[PDB]
Amino acid sequence: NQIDLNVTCRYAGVFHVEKNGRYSISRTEAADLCQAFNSTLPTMDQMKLALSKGFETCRYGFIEGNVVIPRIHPNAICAANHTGVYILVTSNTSHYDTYCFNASAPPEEDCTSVTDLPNSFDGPVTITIVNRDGTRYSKKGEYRTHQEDI
Numbered sequence: 001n002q003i004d005l006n007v008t009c010r011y012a013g014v015f016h017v018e019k020n021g022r023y024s025i026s027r028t029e030a031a032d033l034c035q036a037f038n039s040t041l042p043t044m045d046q047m048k049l050a051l052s053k054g055f056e057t058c059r060y061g062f063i064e065g066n067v068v069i070p071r072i073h074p075n076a077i078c079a080a081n082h083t084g085v086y087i088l089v090t091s092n093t094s095h096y097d098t099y100c101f102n103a104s105a106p107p108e109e110d111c112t113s114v115t116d117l118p119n120s121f122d123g124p125v126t127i128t129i130v131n132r133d134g135t136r137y138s139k140k141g142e143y144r145t146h147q148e149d150i
């Protein structure tokens with residue numbers, strides 16, 4: 001009964017989270033997951049500012065109202081070689097990664113590790129934050145509020 005949350009550097013407060021390293025987060029679960037990080041789904045404007053500070057990924061994830069990939073460098077296998085905030089237009093499927101926005105983060109690039117899930121609630125799941133440098137933090141808890149997500 002274990003969940004890995006792979007997290008990125010923050011850029012202007014925006015970061016990416018993958019659950020178990022596979023596309024597996026619903027839109028409802030995304031909101032709950034950000035809430036557990038004392039964060040919200042980013043707006044498009046927040047994401048554009050994060051991009052301007054150096055944020056890019058090669059993964060689709062939820063923001064407020066869209067599923068996107070921030071891209072700085074063109075890469076053929078990431079967002080069909082686009083740059084900017086690439087918006088997913090057509091997909092059959094509902095489960096992605098998520099982006100999250102924490103207003104209390106530093107204003108530019110913050111590539112320090114994430115050390116807590118401050119707003120997780122009591123629960124039976126071993127939740128492990130996994131940083132890109134391998135640093136891990138674990139706690140027992142839960143963050144999912146919708147039954148359909150568990």
Ligand SMILES: CN(C)CCCN1CCc2cccc(N)c2C1
Pocket residue numbers: 006007008018021022059130131132133
């Ligand atoms: C999911 N694969 C295909 C590539 C996406 C990059 N992942 C790779 C796995 C990983 C592990 C810890 C932290 C982070 N940010 C990441 C990011």
